[PDB]
């Protein structure tokens, strides 16, 4: 039995920026009241985890990163009602407390209990459950999935189908749901529309999936890496364009291709310049542009507000707009019912011990999602 | 008797930026095919007209400005089907051609025949109907209402009720419709919501009227001129704040006052800084901010896209999102039926000949709308 005891297990600890993960032994405290300790089964490598390594995203170090995962409940703290030992679960990097003004709002999902805006790198109670070589180690987004065991607050965990294949459904924890929801829920892509998707990684491919599911007639993929185009077409892109092939700025190309601007555009990269390009390429009177990519820390963009005065809508979202604890089980159920596919996103499956090799595949351009198996 | 003849009449010609208008004789050509010549009855002074004088808004000079007006058809050119001589009409500064992709779209209003995006200062055919001192004079937004007679393209005029009081309904040509539609159509303000309105001139008072019509529970008016607060409360503001009274930036003050951000904010001034402040003060996960104010020519704002990534929606609109030719007659019908009030916006009345005094009143901060009578 491990319940009520400290677990010594393996984890990938990030001690400082721009260094490899250190795979080593950590101690994982048992869960306190309203907390859940989870044996991890599979975790994806999302670009947002690479942002913590690169310093694009600031969060307290040292840290156990990782936020796109699934596993099995090992134990529950006092007062937990929503999961039990042995349940398949997904940690939620955006919590759903159910009590805050956002949780109560029909269109809100960015729960005020989140650890994104102003990251503390702790549990809800402001403490850490992790130590390594006698030092406290920070949590990441209330999840910390690069560990054989994690501890999460109840509001940051969802119970899923006992028959779920966790090596696939872990992508519902971030990249699939974010892209799909950005198209179907945040943009509300319409039947017959023309869409432009900037960035053809795991999240951008999931935006294409959503645009196709919503009945878009044209879906133009934009990436500087033409190796990304074949899989973008497989999942629904009708055309792909590489900005580097053109003398004109790509906003002009896309406005020309779409006979005066697209209905919906998506920025799924994380660059200030492409956020402005994507806004510009949507039709000036009724276009909608959605920012999905995470910008670099503390940098402002420059834009001409006449782009909005003509009638454009500009919005962004975390996690595809989905209220996390309500949505994740339904998405897993939809997957089980063959409503969408996840295999197109998975290009590599590695043991957890090869986390660094997984990140090198992402940085080199080769991979979409690497799944790590514990 | 004047049909098919040049008309000599008085107009207010702007020869140079930052100068008074010159009230002097012009020659107004008869209408060509699908053109309408109109005897003006009343015109409002909108801050956008002043922007032409200040250079905030760049359009070719010399010019006959004015865009907020009503008048009576003097004659129609060949092929005109939608108005006749003796009809009461409102010139439409945003046309409705009914044929372009925007006119066809259910939510579009910024018709591609507009002269706002890249002003030429002409009729649709690229020529002028105005001569002064033997020199061609520019049109403005295809309206040019600061003249006893003007000529407009058919797609830039709407027939209105024959019993209309033109000295009131001229405000449906810009300021009222813009502010009211920005609330009810563009933002879609909800019952019980909290709104913040930056700028309490004629357009921002119209935004308040729309927010109140839509059922908002709290409407916070924001102006640096506290003399504007009594009228804002009369038309529905629940409280007014002057940024100059506070040590902290007003986005922080409004976030505190609204227990975490407002539902809907409106920038109704034309400043880059207040456009950012207005976005920031709406709730970060589900807030909506609407740009109404006209920015200074060719200047970019700076903002942090994290404001959007959390869930905010940012949009702008021309003319309250109204399809102009469909909507203007209906708005006049609704005014006739007492569905909204215009008198709260009218603070001064002058003869056309006292146009310069009317602009002095706006610049001093004393007026909301001055109505000039021909
Ligand atoms: N909003 C959310 O909740 C959320 C969720 C998940 C991911 N993200 C962010 O979404 C972005 C994409 O994540 P991902 O799909 O895992 O990353 P990824 O797999 O690195 O994909 C990014 C793609 O952008 C391409 N690219 C890079 N520069 C350009 C350019 N200048 N023009 C066009 N294409 C370019 C690049 O070749 C790559 O295929 C990252 O910034 C993530 O941090 C946000
Ligand atoms: N989008 C459209 O279709 C449309 C239509 C009509 C007017 N406009 C624009 O809307 C704006 C307002 O027009 P209006 O109501 O006729 O003008 P106005 O009467 O000049 O009202 C502007 C108000 O803003 C106030 N103000 C100025 N600076 C600040 C500040 N820093 N903070 C708070 N309040 C401030 C000022 O005291 C005044 O009461 C102008 O920029 C117009 O050009 C746009
Ligand atoms: O990929 C999801 C994701 C985000 F969208 C962020 F905005 C963020 F800060 C982060 F850490 C993260 F993991
Ligand atoms: O007041 C309406 C109005 C606008 F909203 C503009 F954007 C513009 F350029 C202009 F000239 C105008 F008159
Ligand atoms: Zn919450
Ligand atoms: Zn992610
Ligand atoms: Zn049109
Ligand atoms: Zn105006």
């Amino acid at each position: 039995s491990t319940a009520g005891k400290v677990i010594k297990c393996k984890a990938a600890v990030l001690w400082e920026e721009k260094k490899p993960f250190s795979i080593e032994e950590v101690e994982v405290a048992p869960p306190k009241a309203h907390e859940v300790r989870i044996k991890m089964v599979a975790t994806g490598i999302c670009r947002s985890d690479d942002h913590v390594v690169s310093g694009t995203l600031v969060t307290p170090l040292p840290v156990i990163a990782g936020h796109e995962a699934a596993g099995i409940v090992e134990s529950i703290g006092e007062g937990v009602t929503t999961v039990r030992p042995g349940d398949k679960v997904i940690p939620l990097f955006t919590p759903q407390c159910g009590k805050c003004r956002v949780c109560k709002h029909p269109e809100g999902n960015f729960c005020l209990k989140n650890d994104l805006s102003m990251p503390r790198g702790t549990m809800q109670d402001g403490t850490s459950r992790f130590t390594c070589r006698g030092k406290p180690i920070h949590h990441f987004l209330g999840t910390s999935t690069f560990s054989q065991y994690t501890v999460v607050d109840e509001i940051s965990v969802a119970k899923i189908d006992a028959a779920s294949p966790l090596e696939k459904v872990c992508l519902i924890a971030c990249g699939f749901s974010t892209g799909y929801g950005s198209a179907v829920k945040v943009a509300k892509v319409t039947q017959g529309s023309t869409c432009a998707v900037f960035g053809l990684g795991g999240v951008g491919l999931s935006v294409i999936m959503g645009c196709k599911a919503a009945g878009a007639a044209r879906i133009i993929g934009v990436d500087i890496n033409k190796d990304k185009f074949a899989k973008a077409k497989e999942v629904g892109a009708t055309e792909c364009v590489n900005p580097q092939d053109y003398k004109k700025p790509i906003q002009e190309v896309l406005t020309e291709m779409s006979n005066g601007g697209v209905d919906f555009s998506f920025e799924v990269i994380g660059r200030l310049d492409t956020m402005v390009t994507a806004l510009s390429c949507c039709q000036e009177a009724y276009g909608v542009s959605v920012i999905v990519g995470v910008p670099p820390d503390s940098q402002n963009l420059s834009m001409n507000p006449m782009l909005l005065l003509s009638g454009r809508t500009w919005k962004g979202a975390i996690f595809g707009g989905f209220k996390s604890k309500d949505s994740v089980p339904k998405l897993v159920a939809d997957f089980m019912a063959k409503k969408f596919a996840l295999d197109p996103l998975i290009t590599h499956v590695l043991p957890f011990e090869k986390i660094n090799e997984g990140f090198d595949l992402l940085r080199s351009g080769e991979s979409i999602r690497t799944i790590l198996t514990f």
Side-chain angles (χ1 to χ4, degrees), chain A:
Chain A
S1 71
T2 49
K5 303 177 191 158
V6 174
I7 288 175
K8 293 184 194 188
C9 71
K10 196 178 297 188
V13 175
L14 186 68
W15 287 105
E16 79 187 83
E17 71 162 12
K18 306 195 180 189
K19 296 291 185 159
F21 293 93
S22 188
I23 297 146
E24 66 183 287
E25 187 165 70
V26 303
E27 308 84 42
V28 187
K32 299 194 197 151
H34 296 105
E35 303 174 358
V36 179
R37 185 159 66 175
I38 306 169
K39 187 173 185 190
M40 301 314 305
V41 170
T43 185
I45 296 170
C46 172
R47 175 64 73 170
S48 299
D49 301 300
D50 184 59
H51 292 338
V52 173
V53 184
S54 74
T56 282
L57 255 186
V58 179
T59 198
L61 302 183
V63 66
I64 298 179
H67 63 289
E68 185 181 74
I72 298 170
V73 177
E74 173 266 347
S75 65
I76 62 175
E78 195 176 3
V80 170
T81 60
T82 61
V83 300
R84 297 194 197 72
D87 283 348
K88 289 178 167 176
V89 289
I90 286 174
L92 310 172
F93 77 83
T94 303
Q96 185 174 356
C97 75
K99 290 165 174 140
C100 77
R101 210 172 54 176
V102 175
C103 285
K104 290 189 159 156
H105 189 286
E107 306 303 321
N109 78 325
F110 190 46
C111 172
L112 292 164
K113 300 280 190 179
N114 77 78
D115 196 43
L116 281 74
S117 293
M118 293 181 66
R120 299 189 283 180
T122 66
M123 302 294 297
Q124 285 297 326
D125 72 359
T127 68
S128 167
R129 300 280 170 283
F130 297 118
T131 55
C132 188
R133 311 182 183 170
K135 301 180 203 149
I137 312 296
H138 292 100
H139 294 244
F140 178 59
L141 308 180
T143 58
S144 287
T145 70
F146 295 165
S147 180
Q148 292 172 332
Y149 291 84
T150 192
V151 181
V152 301
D153 290 285
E154 181 177 29
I155 62 163
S156 297
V157 66
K159 184 189 178 179
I160 66 167
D161 182 331
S164 301
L166 295 192
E167 81 281 2
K168 298 190 182 310
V169 301
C170 55
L171 294 190
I172 292 167
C174 182
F176 172 78
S177 305
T178 295
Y180 192 83
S182 294
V184 311
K185 181 165 185 78
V186 180
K188 303 181 195 55
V189 170
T190 55
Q191 187 149 21
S193 67
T194 294
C195 296
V197 181
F198 288 76
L200 302 174
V203 185
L205 292 168
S206 302
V207 173
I208 292 170
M209 297 174 173
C211 290
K212 180 177 169 168
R218 292 181 64 189
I219 303 161
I220 309 164
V222 186
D223 203 299
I224 60 170
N225 185 350
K226 71 184 177 169
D227 297 341
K228 296 292 171 172
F229 296 169
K231 178 64 60 63
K233 291 178 166 183
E234 292 178 19
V235 301
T238 54
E239 293 171 292
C240 292
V241 298
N242 181 348
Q244 297 173 342
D245 288 345
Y246 294 87
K247 304 187 190 187
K248 301 177 159 155
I250 200 74
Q251 58 193 44
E252 296 180 7
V253 172
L254 290 163
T255 296
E256 182 278 341
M257 287 174 70
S258 63
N259 297 293
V262 303
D263 296 289
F264 304 92
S265 66
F266 302 85
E267 199 281 2
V268 205
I269 302 161
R271 297 174 53 90
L272 297 181
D273 55 7
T274 47
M275 288 173 192
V276 182
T277 293
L279 176 64
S280 303
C281 80
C282 80
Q283 203 282 334
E284 64 180 348
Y286 55 77
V288 171
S289 188
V290 179
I291 303 181
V292 186
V294 175
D297 179 76
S298 296
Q299 295 193 24
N300 285 2
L301 61 75
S302 177
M303 62 78 71
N304 189 325
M306 287 300 309
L307 291 175
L308 294 177
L309 199 62
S310 52
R312 294 183 177 84
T313 304
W314 204 13
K315 66 201 311 191
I318 302 296
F319 196 55
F322 284 118
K323 291 178 176 288
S324 60
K325 192 159 180 157
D326 297 335
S327 301
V328 162
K330 291 186 293 163
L331 286 165
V332 167
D334 285 353
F335 174 67
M336 295 304 290
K338 312 286 172 149
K339 297 195 177 168
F340 53 88
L342 296 171
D343 287 350
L345 305 177
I346 298 170
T347 56
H348 297 80
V349 187
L350 300 172
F352 171 63
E353 294 78 14
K354 293 187 191 289
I355 183 163
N356 288 309
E357 296 89 331
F359 276 81
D360 294 334
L361 285 167
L362 179 69
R363 293 171 187 138
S364 74
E366 180 173 343
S367 60
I368 300 294
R369 283 295 201 263
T370 295
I371 308 299
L372 302 178
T373 53
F374 286 90

